[PDB]
Design a protein around this ligand. Structure first.
Ligand SMILES: NC(=O)C1=CN([C@@H]2O[C@H](COP(=O)(O)OP(=O)(O)OC[C@H]3O[C@@H](n4cnc5c(N)ncnc54)[C@H](O)[C@@H]3O)[C@@H](O)[C@H]2O)C=CC1
Ligand SMILES: NC(=O)C1=CN([C@@H]2O[C@H](COP(=O)(O)OP(=O)(O)OC[C@H]3O[C@@H](n4cnc5c(N)ncnc54)[C@H](O)[C@@H]3O)[C@@H](O)[C@H]2O)C=CC1
Ligand SMILES: [Cl-]
Ligand SMILES: [Cl-]
Ligand SMILES: [Cl-]
Ligand SMILES: [Cl-]
Lengths: 403, 403, 382, 382
């Protein structure tokens, strides 16, 4: 069926996950443990779930899928004994309920998205903390929220921040996040990017990728920031940096990539050109203040699929993509297959590290242990047939000396 | 005179150092302190010394200049009251003696190159430790040697590793180290790089820059490594990775960029093609084993300026550039002026941080304090006239929350 | 109305057509003239039709349109007094009948597609030549056909090749964007084989290297092979290159760039693409024990050796434009029709290149709409 | 011997000339023939002379050589029986006398520089035409002059334009490499102004953007200005661009691309470069209160406003080759002389393009020396 075909495609090109299954599927180290997951459901993340199941885990998943798609992939997962709640998750109260359903299964380990399950676990479903042994979190927003639980002394389980990885810097995110973001914008609008002014708010991993891709498509790029180091980076990449209040005066597209709230103010929005297009690439739908748009608009209308027009008190109309939600995951090509294979390998090993070591770990956010980065790098090399050098004893002693 | 003209050129394009002088030259925070320095002497580093002097420091310098050049720059520094010992430093025992001369001045702060002054201070000139308040070290080799003093419990003063900087990743070192390395190789050999096999040993900051520039010049690049993460990086940049023993069989150029010893063995050297060219971009002259070359060669001859031919037992001749010493600093264009301005600003602030805080600091190697990176980034933005955004209170509270 | 909302969206982002309406909709230079059109019917082309109408033209359109998806746009054009013959055009004989219906209206000017209206006008409906004053042709196939018509001595009206324009660039980048979209696979750290090192192959190879691929080039011309080596690529025979290829891209314009032995040497999961319907397919179809659709635009062929290989886009060129790009194209086409209006009596029955003055006028209008100012040459200059 | 060591170095890295010696030094096709040459005398060109000699030629050379730095190479050639007239060639009349001395030897074939030997042969030393059988010309100025000689009807011997070769590419990259070398300044994070957006300007602009510069383009042609915008650059008038420029690069092939008012608007420390002796200089010389040499290849001009601006390479094209590149060039030139040897009786007194067979032979030899194998077309192909 179509769901099995989507999974079969990705399985061909996930050599690390396939090697992990080869290495551990007989031993079944996760037998008798439940792994709860919050993911965007699609064939790649389905393969992560499948690999966890091959390792013996009971896997229970909620999908953030406001797109109303990948049902075929959900049905394929059900046929393999994996529990998936992803339908109707455009409605936030349904996504929330589906998280509650994952927590009803009393997971031993959580692979979280944006920290959603873990935060609920510490705020409203504290009975799950008895059984919860560890959390793996991959996103910046997630790490931020979990670090805040830590700093306020509310965190109760060890968390591994997998976005630590030495291998984030490995790939250029212009062909991951940048490419998938511009593909989505181009599909929703059919507008030219070349020769346009594109404003990117935030110049971290996500924003830089979006900015570089926009420049590759021939746009004039303007970057906004609050961190002076990041602003200097953007300048040294050839971009213009200025405050948002000035940038909005000339923007054709404004893309938020900050992980922050209210990156446009009311006054910024009233400065936009007639026909400006706004989109969000951050985790939550508050970067572009949709509630402010809805409050100040004289008229609201659906201009085309996935595009909301807001006509302002000043007579101008601005357009919001995807209700200000994350724009680039709907089509299921957020990142290349082999990049997700790498990321998922790191997450599987993070879960196995927590299985082995959680009793020894404090309720703190840890950086990804270096041994995991090295393990996965070595497995990648082996899968490519690449051999490297080994230090001699003379060399080891040289490197530990002050000669 | 020519020395003043060289300094006048760089002073025009060092806005951070000029701003630092504007900010601090009246207050003279370094009045009554001696700063000892080991540098490659040229107009840029001369300007660092000049700026320290404007801040009140007595500045005493040794130049690693086996090149036998920049005398005019040394004479210009002398005319401004700065003490410079750089002549005849091709002879290692003279470079050593010049280090001893710097330590005779009992420096309060050291700006070191490769840790040379600091290591001598801990091993042979321990009387200088009474007055020594802090060390700033910029190179990887330096940090390694000082960390080894720390790990063995021999370090006695605080050290700031300025190569920590958030801003190392700012510039692409293919147009710093990579460009200056290939310029030197091209000048010494007059050989084509395009369509050649180039082997780079080590894929850190230095090696990656060298590899990318070689690829930009049209060479087929092969990378050797001992760190699996770095090897995966090289593969993801489009290069071939294999063990040195295989790479040497096809190499036209072998460039060492490891910070290690004996990156070629005798057996590797006997595998090289007739006419292979070898060069070192690492700090010390032991990466390419010159003593092994000298020991196993049937004949040795100067083939052209800066190029030594070694004819081996196998009948083949290989060529070594610059006696296996660092190849790219002789021409004084190692890095662009404005990049050195940034680096030197970080080093000046590191010295001022040590002045203010050394009594509170342990005898350990510290990462560059984050406040210094941010200070210098802000100064860079201000010098370019760039303004950025400031977080609102709502935003600050959002970022400290788990919502 | 959904048709009207589609047209309203594109009208917001078609500044050249909007400025053309502003400049000419009171003069109405095309009042009393009929413009016949064959075009793919959708909101953008609808806006070209609307703009011609604002200029006074009676517009009569055939839509080559094998799906009903743009029938709401058709219906919106009909409500504006534009005549649209588009429904049921998935059948070949109905497309032709709709072309006949356009010609029944005795157009003064034709905006053609593949030269279909013009060729019928010269062969089967010669009475239309009485009133036909000029033809604008933007399609490559169309300009080819009308040029061939000229060379037989049978062309009877002036034609403007709008695609022969200094702004013709409506690459390696396009090819890899398409490959990545259709496969969702990583290019970095892969072995990419490019067959052929002319302008196209070289661009594909350079872009692949910039994406982090290790690139191998195959060639038959030693001069081109040396060029590939000097660009930093490995050159070797295809028989060797296929043993390590993750992607094989034929850019060579030869037949049978892969033999049966080459295909049986491919790695399991290799991806094949053309960037002719003969470079790589008949060979694949002949040797494959199973053919299946793996993904949209990706066909799997499982071979006698148990391995499976993947062909992109059934072997067609793997490398349909944004609103503002169509705006630019449509402005050149409107001005070409106006040039024919003004000048057809002085023009020969031949295919003319787009007059350079039209390129410069549209470029200037584009700059004006962007708020851009440029320099002007001084007397001494020039 | 230092001359001999220089020649020994280059002989190690000239595999095409070494293979040519291997193939022809026993046949000695040039025995009984004199080859006259005007060339810049250094170890690489010495090796061309040596190789011609191994093929049997009596070689007689003039060195256009305004310094004595390569007199050791000259002396080494003299020890091998090659006749060298190079000393004191910093004086113009001595260079000419040395050319006269080459022609005194009644060359059968000339390898010319700027066409100097050939033009003298046709104007003042017509007796040489009795024995002169062919001319090889690799220089652009030379091919221009000999082509002009043909068009007057006064050319009397066959000439091969070796530079009209499919391997002619002996860019934006060259320009910025030169700028960086001569200034040691950062390009990233700077405002770069590029005047002109033809092939050259576009390459300079694209490379600058890839180095991290913010690029501004100035133009007078609206079509080119739109192209620059669609590439992601800012377009504005030069009068505005100069107010923020860190670098201004004229790539436009116009006169006076900068006025006096433009120059007085430059930032203190702006860097100017041409990539004609008239784009930017006379204006600078006229307005400057002080001129000084700031660095090698960099002139400072201090203006009436107190600011100083910097001109690279006195306004000459800011954008002399590796050993293996000269090897390739010399192989084409040797084969051109051999082609003239074999075929001059069948050739007209005109300038011929390099025969394509010579391109293909040298490319094949280059591939062979690298150990590279390529494909070959099948019958069906094709
Ligand atoms: N759409 C996707 O596929 C992805 C989404 N994300 C999400 O995107 C967001 C950013 O992620 P990362 O780039 O990894 O974060 P990051 O922390 O590396 O970068 C965010 C940047 O935004 C800046 N910033 C914060 N507030 C700002 C403001 N008011 N104006 C301008 N700049 C501001 C920060 O200084 C920082 O440099 C997070 O919400 C993350 O979860 C991240 C990666 C992929
Ligand atoms: N020439 C110049 O201008 C510069 C010189 N340096 C010097 O270059 C050296 C390297 O510096 P960085 O790149 O910052 O160091 P790094 O530590 O970032 O990178 C060195 C790399 O070499 C690898 N390596 C170590 N031993 C190896 C071996 N036997 N074979 C292959 N790879 C091996 C390590 O795994 C590491 O990835 C140091 O000596 C440093 O002081 C650094 C920057 C500029
Ligand atoms: Cl723009
Ligand atoms: Cl891109
Ligand atoms: Cl090669
Ligand atoms: Cl490069």
């Amino acid at each position: 069926n179509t769901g099995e075909m989507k999974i079969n495609w990705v399985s061909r090109y996930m050599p690390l996950l396939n090697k992990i299954a080869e290495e551990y599927s007989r031993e079944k180290p996760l037998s008798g443990f439940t792994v709860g997951m919050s993911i965007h459901l699609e064939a790649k993340t389905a393969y992560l779930a499948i690999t966890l199941s091959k390792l013996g885990a009971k896997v229970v998943i909620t999908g953030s899928n406001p797109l109303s798609t990948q049902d075929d992939v959900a049905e394929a997962l059900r046929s393999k004994g994996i529990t998936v709640y992803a339908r109707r998750t455009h409605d936030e109260s349904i996504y929330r309920e589906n998280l509650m359903k994952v927590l009803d299964e009393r997971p031993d380990f959580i692979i979280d998205d944006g920290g959603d399950l873990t935060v609920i676990s510490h705020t409203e479903r504290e009975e799950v903390l008895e059984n919860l042994k560890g959390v793996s979190e991959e996103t910046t927003t997630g790490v931020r929220r979990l670090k805040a639980l830590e700093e306020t002394g509310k965190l109760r389980v060890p968390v591994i921040a997998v976005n630590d990885s030495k291998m984030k810097y490995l790939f250029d995110n212009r062909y991951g996040t940048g490419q998938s973001t511009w593909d989505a914008i181009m599909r929703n609008t059919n507008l030219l990017v070349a020769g346009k002014n594109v404003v990117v708010a935030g110049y971290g991993w996500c924003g830089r990728g979006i900015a570089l891709r926009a420049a590759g498509l021939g746009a004039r790029v303007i970057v906004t920031e609050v961190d002076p180091v990041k602003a200097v980076e953007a300048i040294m990449d050839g971009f213009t940096v200025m405050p948002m209040k000035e940038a909005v005066k000339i923007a054709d597209f404004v893309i938020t990539a900050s992980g922050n709230t209210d990156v446009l103010s009311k006054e910024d929005i009233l400065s936009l050109k007639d026909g400006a297009v706004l989109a969000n690439a951050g985790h939550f739908n508050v970067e572009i203040p949709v509630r402010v748009l809805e409050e100040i608009a004289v008229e609201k209308f659906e201009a085309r699929p996935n595009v909301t027009g807001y006509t302002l008190e000043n007579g101008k109309t601005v357009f919001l993509l995807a209700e200000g939600r994350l724009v680039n995951l709907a089509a299921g090509d957020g990142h290349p297959v082999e990049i997700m294979d790498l990321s998922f390998a790191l997450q599987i090993f993070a879960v196995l590290y927590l299985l082995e070591n959680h009793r020894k770990m404090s309720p703190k956010v840890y950086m990804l242990p270096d041994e995991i980065d090295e393990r996965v790098a070595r497995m990648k090399l082996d899968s490519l047939g690449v051999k490297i050098d080994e230090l001699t004893e003379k060399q080891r002693r040289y490197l530990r000396s002050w000669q």
